[PDB]
Every structure is written in structure tokens, then in C-alpha cells.
Ligand binder design. Structure first.
Ligand SMILES: CCN1C(=O)c2cccc3c(S(=O)(=O)N4CCCC4)ccc1c23
Length: 127
């Protein structure tokens, strides 16, 4: 039983920008989701060894999680808000792929995804 290396949070050869929207994605969007009662399963990479989900990384090949997202934001990893929104989308999609409608974890993800969409419906203007 082996977890893979977690996604990178720094990369010196990737272009980065400090954007008004990206600051909002950390200050408001991430930080708010993080405090939700259903946030905890998503706050770190899936440890398939601890959770005894040995088939997880047999199935999920582009893992993502809010802890990785938060580190990427704090580390100025992204060029634009769409890159970071894509990571959120990968996180939710992975959960929907591995699990089935009605599972507790899927109900948690559905609730978080709706809050996430509410929060990104309106982003600060790329002044
Ligand atoms: C979001 C990533 N991710 C999955 O795809 C997934 C599948 C089955 C269980 C779990 C757990 S758990 O065991 O702590 N759990 C919390 C609620 C249900 C059970 C935490 C995080 C998980 C899973």
C-alpha cells in the first residue's frame, strides 16, 4: 500500500501572477469553504493507506485537494483565477468519480460545490 507523491505546490519554471481575483480566491473563497462543517475530508491529499481505500489511486490519476489549493495560492503558484478554479473542479470531480450518489462523502462534496459556485459567481474585477 503506497500513496503517490502529492501534487506540487511550487514550480520555479511556471509563470505566476498576483491577481485581484486570485487574492479573492484565497481570502474569501478558499478560507470560507475551509470553515464549512463538511470541509475536513478535503483539507489534505487522500491518504489511501490511512483511509484503507487501496483502490483510490488505482482510479484517481489527477488527485487534488483544498490543502494543495491553499498552498498553491499562498505560494503564488497560479497565473490566473481560472487555473485555480480548475483545481477546485478536479477535486470535486475526483470525488464524484470514485464515489456514488448518496454516499456521505458525495453529499459533503455537493454541499461544498454549491457554496463554491455561489462564491465564484462574482469575482473582483481584473482592475
Ligand atoms: C474527498 C476525498 N475522499 C474520497 O474520495 C472518499 C471515499 C470514501 C471515504 C472518504 C473519507 S472518510 O473515510 O474519512 N469519510 C468522510 C465521509 C465519508 C467517510 C475522507 C476523504 C475522502 C473519502
Amino acid at each position: 500500500s503506497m500513496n503517490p507523491p502529492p501534487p506540487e505546490t511550487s514550480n520555479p519554471n511556471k509563470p505566476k501572477r498576483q491577481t485581484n481575483q486570485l487574492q479573492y480566491l484565497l481570502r474569501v473563497v478558499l478560507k470560507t469553504l475551509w470553515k464549512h462543517q463538511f470541509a475536513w475530508p478535503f483539507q489534505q491529499p487522500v491518504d489511501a493507506v490511512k483511509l484503507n481505500l487501496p483502490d483510490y489511486y488505482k482510479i484517481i490519476k489527477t488527485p487534488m485537494d483544498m490543502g494543495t489549493i491553499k498552498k498553491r495560492l499562498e505560494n503564488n503558484y497560479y497565473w490566473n483565477a481560472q487555473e485555480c478554479i480548475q483545481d477546485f473542479n478536479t477535486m470535486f470531480t475526483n470525488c464524484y468519480i470514485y464515489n456514488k450518489p448518496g454516499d456521505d462523502i458525495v453529499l459533503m462534496a455537493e454541499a461544498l460545490e454549491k457554496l463554491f459556485l455561489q462564491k465564484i459567481n462574482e469575482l473582483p474585477t481584473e482592475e
